[PDB]
Ligand binder design. Structure first.
Ligand SMILES: Nc1ncnc2c1ncn2[C@@H]1O[C@H](COP(=O)(O)OP(=O)(O)CP(=O)(O)O)[C@@H](O)[C@H]1O
Ligand SMILES: [Mg+2]
Ligand SMILES: [Mg+2]
Length: 332
């Protein structure tokens, strides 16, 4: 029907039921473009992680999974800054229409004995009883959510046990005795464990065998089969290739190009200029975390100066290259 669209009808049903539009339309959304391709618009590489997530969602939709557990659960190992959160955010926006559907719990904030009360609510008779838990209240308000637990090995054992309850039961009972349904959640657990150790061993000149033995020993110390067996998949994120970093540079320039387009200004970067940003914006210690401020300092700031001086004007095609002091700008 031309005048009344699929989205029009889904929005009515969405507001009446609380079910996200993209969830109601899951059968149409996948016809438009497959989930993997949609996630890859924002997530570069990490093909294995994307396939793991998409495969779980597919098994769930097809009616092959336990209806009393979450949609899927994953442990994302490997280094920092190479897409674990980029994937969780994109997944939330794609499945549930907004990044507000991603609930983030940083386990470095849940290391102590009283963390459970922060997580699921203080007991009756203790300060903070009416406020409830950070996790339980968030999931009650948004049953259709991606839940990101960061640095899971750091959680106090009592907090870890509540995670296990989510995996096993598909639900939690909060301090008010209310049940909190997790059946429509996707659970993503992250850990860096082993990555700093590898960098340390490479720095010290350790033989590969020694590095390898130490990584497995630390993983064994924190992650037992009883826990791992509960998960759909364990995925080790990989360091990014040179080409992958370049693709990320281009994505991270999207907003800037858009702002410039309002004034009919465009940017044309030499391959050298692109590589300049890629080199400074990525390293093994922080992944691509540095890139945002590299673009800010190396490109946006001097471009801003040129614009304010009137050296770059409305309608200009700006050529961006490398010079002795940093990026250089030319206009024909
Ligand atoms: N695979 C990828 N695809 C697209 N962008 C990526 C990417 N990996 C990293 N980035 C970029 O670098 C930033 C850091 O990525 P991300 O937040 O996914 O890492 P992370 O969750 O491991 C950091 P932390 O350990 O602090 O949580 C992202 O915001 C994004 O701009
Ligand atoms: Mg993160
Ligand atoms: Mg963190």
């Amino acid at each position: 029907h031309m005048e009344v669209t699929e989205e029009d009808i889904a929005e009515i049903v969405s507001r009446w039921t609380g079910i996200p539009v993209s969830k109601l339309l899951e059968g149409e959304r996948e016809k438009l473009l497959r989930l993997e391709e949609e996630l890859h618009k924002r997530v570069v590489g990490q093909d294995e992680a994307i396939r793991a997530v998409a495969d779980a969602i597919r098994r769930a939709r097809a009616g092959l999974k336990d209806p009393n557990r979450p949609i899927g659960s994953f442990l994302f190992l490997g280094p920092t800054g190479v897409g674990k959160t980029e994937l969780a955010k994109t997944l939330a926006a794609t499945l549930f229409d907004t990044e507000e559907a991603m609930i983030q719990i940083d386990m470095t904030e849940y290391m102590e004995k009283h963390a459970v009360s922060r997580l699921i609510g203080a007991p009756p008779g203790y300060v903070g009883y009416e406020e409830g838990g950070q996790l339980t209240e968030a999931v009650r308000r948004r049953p259709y959510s991606v839940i990101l637990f960061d640095e899971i090995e750091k959680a106090h054992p009592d907090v870890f046990n509540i995670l296990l309850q989510i995996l096993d039961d598909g639900r939690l009972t909060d301090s008010h005795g209310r049940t909190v349904d997790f059946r429509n959640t996707v659970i993503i657990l992250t850990s860096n464990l082993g990555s700093p150790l590898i960098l340390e061993g490479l720095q010290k000149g350790w033989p590969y065998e020694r590095i390898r033995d130490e990584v497995f020993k630390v993983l064994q110390q924190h992650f037992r089969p009883e826990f791992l067996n509960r998960l759909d998949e364990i995925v080790v994120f990989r360091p990014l290739t040179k080409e992958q970093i370049r693709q990320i540079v281009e994505i991270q320039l999207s907003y800037l190009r858009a702002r410039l387009a309002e004034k009919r200004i465009s940017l044309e970067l030499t391959e050298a200029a692109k590589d300049f940003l890629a080199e400074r914006g990525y390293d093994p210690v922080f992944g691509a975390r540095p890139l945002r401020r590299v673009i800010q300092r190396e490109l946006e700031t001097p471009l801003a100066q040129k614009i304010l001086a009137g050296e770059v004007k409305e309608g200009d095609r700006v050529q961006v290259d490398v010079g002795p002091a940093g990026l250089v700008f030319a206009v024909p």
